Amino acid sequence: GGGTIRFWREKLEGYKKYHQIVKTIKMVTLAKYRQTVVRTRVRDQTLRYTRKALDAKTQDDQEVIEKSECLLYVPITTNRGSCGALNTNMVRYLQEVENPKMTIISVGKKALDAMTKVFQDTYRRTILNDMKQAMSFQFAAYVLEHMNTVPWDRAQIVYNRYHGAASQKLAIFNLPKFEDWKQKLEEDSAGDGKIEEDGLLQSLPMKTALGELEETAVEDFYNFHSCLAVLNAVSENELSEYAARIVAVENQL
Amino acid sequence: NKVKVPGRKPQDEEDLTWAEADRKLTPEERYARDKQMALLDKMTSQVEE
């Protein structure tokens, strides 16, 4: 049993090595996680007013596909793995919702191989932020400059929501188009302000004041709040990445 | 349309993987190739210039 005992010796030493390498992954992950947990104390404030603008009632899918001509989707994925089922469930939701008039510009290296192989033509490209520096307003603006290439009608950003260290669910931002949103603004600012969906905030004084506001300023208002939405989505998915990696590493251990 | 998995059958895509080859050494080989082609393209540039 010479070959057999040497085989098991090799596997044993290989696993003793691989174990401490995975522990190194864990420690680096905590070194990058504790920096980000500071955000959790200072969380859920930057779109507190923005919801009042970009939120609407939960519109059905079958109606918006008929209303629209070219939808858009933005799944926010990661650059490095050992995360979990985040990327895979993010793909499962898109094939769950898949339809003819869609387009995908993702974020992260892991949607590069997946999206092109599952969604052949709708997927176009991606964006890659090497995470040596935190994410920037200019980075979210660079994403807006990519999205503006498309004449999209509704942009569904998809990301992961850090409910807790043990729960990283999905979450979406349904962004209407500017030219449709301005008309919905005028239509709702005309009639009396009655909330058409529970849990929604009334915004009639806002939809009057924005109607009073000039063109370029409202364009910048829209681009600005969408930039903050994008940046908050990426930040929440970063925190969910660093919260799910520790689980998908301790289970490996 | 789901996935064009490679296989032995003709309808499936071409499988250029080899079982005898080892996956463990593949990343170092990939980096080796990606560096070698950069060095060759730079040597070509130096010779042309």
């Binding site: 050992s82 990327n87 191989d113 998908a248 | 789901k2 996935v3 032995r8």
Partner: protein
């Protein structure tokens, strides 16, 4: 029957090579092709299981007698991707793709009845 058996054995040899990864990291760290091969080899392995009339005492099911011509078409459908919407568990301990589709209908029915049941329990709650 020859080519099908050869391709099944090859698929399972690949599933075995991928076990060394799946046991360590997970299915989420595999390429789309790899995890499709995994999700299909698992289906083949569960379909290979079946009950026998002798072991009715244990599996609690009547035993089936699969004819060769109906044995080859089922593997060919499971090999060419002709049946991938069916889940993995519909292949466990059954005989014949008709029995598969029956069991899958039964499980879909039961799952929907559980969803209406939980809906009514939530409305009453």
């Amino acid at each position: 029957h020859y080519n099908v058996a050869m391709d099944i054995v090859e698929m399972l040899t690949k599933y075995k090579e991928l076990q060394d990864i799946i046991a360590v990291l997970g299915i989420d760290e595999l390429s789309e092709e790899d995890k499709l091969i995994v999700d299909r080899a698992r289906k083949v392995a569960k379909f290979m299981s079946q009950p026998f009339a002798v072991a009715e005492v244990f599996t609690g099911m009547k035993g089936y007698y699969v004819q060769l011509e109906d044995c080859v078409s089922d593997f060919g459908s499971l090999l060419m991707g002709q049946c991938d919407n069916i889940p993995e568990m519909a292949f466990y301990m059954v005989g014949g793709l008709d029995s598969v589709k029956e069991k899958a209908a039964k499980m879909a029915a039961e799952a929907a009845a559980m969803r209406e049941r939980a809906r009514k329990a939530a409305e009453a709650k």
